[PDB]
Scaffold this active site. Structure first.
Site: not given
Ligand SMILES: Nc1nc2c(ncn2[C@@H]2O[C@H](COP(=O)(O)OP(=O)(O)O)[C@@H](O)[C@H]2O)c(=O)[nH]1
Ligand SMILES: *[C@@H]1O[C@H](CO)[C@@H](O)[C@H](O)[C@H]1NC(C)=O
Length: 429
Positions: A13, A15, A244
């Site tokens: 999972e 962040f 994303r």
């Molecule tokens: N800095 C940055 N990191 C991102 C962005 N989108 C995704 N990430 C990275 O990819 C991870 C995807 O996991 P999460 O935060 O659970 O979001 P999800 O996968 O979009 O549901 C994020 O925590 C970030 O580390 C963004 O727009 N900016």
């Protein structure tokens, strides 16, 4: 009599799904305390090789207004054993025509027994956030369906009465109680970002985005418990987009726009709103961002936070979110929890809902499904319409979504179900 609650989540999972689980567990602690138990929440180190404090990302003083919280390193400094691990797993038979709240100790389903091993009678070894010397005195798996309240009940069960510190693994198994209502939002509202991160983000706004809280009307009270409802935030003179990609391209392609599709969308919004500045939060590689920029009008300027200094990846991500959160207009990515947390920040700041709950459509579907509008709440046949579906309980593997409705049994029959449940699956872990 202090008691300590620790937790962890499925290894795969991300962040922002983990931020949502915090709220589920924090509400279990709230309920425990409301019922007379002196429970303290121990904040799990941020990991996937690292073991990072919550201070780096969040304002502990804010979190502490909702329930008492400590860092895991502080918990270790008290030289207290972890008395019990409760793993948490599904009922193998699955949920039925009603989603029954229940729990029961059961034989461990995979991968539980490959992650905890009884090396002495009172010494169970496991990941423990990468800490080699930490261990638990006891271990068991419990099948559970239910919510923050159900977890409260489990932790009060006589089976654990002799423990003072208990760790609940696979906490994503638990659902929110009263999704989107007061206590959900109190927990969300308490998760203020770290001041150092807010300072860096505000420096960027000033220098690049003609933006500050004064002009944007986005000033928030220092103490989150004093927040009041508003829809009068204006935001800086920029458009915010969360773009994303990465894994989303390889588990989610059909509901995302292409690079040209994205260009088109941004150009159109910028013309409609008379905005010429765009803040781009993305995980996409430089090349893809470069190809996006090259497809845009020469009048439009695209900004990103890239002068990251000594900041870690999670801090940068928070900064991207805060910057998106202060835009005059925000558009996000389908089913991304990173986007969901931005929408929630906008709710807290007080933007009109039109400016917040927007999602980038795929090229061949300009009237695509837009995100559910779970609006902030500060206060607590004749069936109402069904609510929105909740966000998926899990960001990877199979999870749950629900929707609910109500009916006044005093002046109507109110026959049938008031809740529906379905499996959701955002991507593989
Ligand atoms: N800095 C940055 N990191 C991102 C962005 N989108 C995704 N990430 C990275 O990819 C991870 C995807 O996991 P999460 O935060 O659970 O979001 P999800 O996968 O979009 O549901 C994020 O925590 C970030 O580390 C963004 O727009 N900016
Ligand atoms: C409590 O522990 C006993 C085993 O010692 C077990 O039979 C029981 O199922 C547990 N209760 C619950 C509700 O999990």
């Amino acid at each position: 009599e202090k008691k300590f609650l620790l937790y962890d989540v499925n290894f795969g999972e991300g962040f922002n799904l983990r931020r949502d689980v915090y709220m589920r567990v924090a509400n279990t602690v709230r309920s425990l305390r409301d019922s007379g138990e002196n429970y303290i929440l121990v904040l799990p180190p941020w990991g996937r090789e690292v073991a990072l404090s919550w201070r780096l990302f969040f304002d502990l003083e804010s979190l502490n207004r909702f329930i008492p919280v400590i860092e895991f390193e502080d918990f270790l400094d008290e030289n207290r054993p972890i008395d019990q691990v409760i793993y948490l797993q599904h009922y193998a038979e699955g949920w039925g025509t009603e989603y029954v709240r229940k729990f029961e100790k059961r034989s461990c389903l995979p991968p539980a027994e490959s992650h905890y091993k009884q090396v002495e009678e009172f010494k169970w070894k496991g990941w423990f956030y990468s800490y080699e010397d930490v261990y638990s005195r006891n271990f068991q798996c419990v099948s559970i369906q239910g919510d923050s309240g159900t977890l409260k009940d489990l932790l009060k069960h006589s089976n654990f009465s002799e423990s003072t510190s208990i760790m609940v693994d696979r906490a994503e198994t638990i659902l929110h109680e009263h999704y989107g209502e007061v206590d959900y939002w109190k927990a969300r509202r308490s998760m203020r970002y770290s001041n150092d991160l807010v300072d860096v983000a505000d420096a960027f706004r000033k220098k690049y985005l003609d933006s500050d809280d004064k002009r944007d009307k986005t000033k928030l009270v220092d103490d989150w418990t004093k927040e009041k409802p508003r829809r009068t935030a204006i935001g800086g003179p920029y458009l915010g987009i969360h773009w994303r990609r990465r894994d989303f391209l390889y588990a989610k392609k059909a509901q995302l726009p292409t690079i040209p599709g994205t260009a088109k969308i941004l150009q159109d919004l910028c013309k409609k709103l008379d905005l010429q500045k765009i803040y781009l939060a993305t995980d996409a590689p430089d090349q893809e961002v470069d190809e996006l920029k090259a497809l845009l009008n020469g009048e439009l300027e695209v900004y990103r936070f890239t002068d990251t200094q000594k900041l870690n990846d999670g801090q940068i991500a928070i900064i991207d979110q805060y910057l998106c959160a202060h835009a005059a207009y925000f558009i996000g990515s389908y089913e991304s929890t990173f986007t969901f947390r931005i929408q929630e920040d906008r709710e807290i700041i007080g933007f009109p809902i039109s400016t917040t709950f927007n999602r980038l459509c795929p090229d061949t579907e300009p009237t695509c499904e837009q995100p559910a509008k779970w609006k902030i709440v500060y206060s607590s046949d004749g069936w109402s319409p069904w609510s929105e579906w909740t966000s998926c309980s899990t960001s990877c593997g199979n999870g749950i979504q629900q929707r609910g409705r109500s009916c006044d049994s005093l002046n109507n029959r109110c026959e049938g179900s008031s809740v529906q449940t379905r499996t959701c699956h955002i991507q593989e872990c």
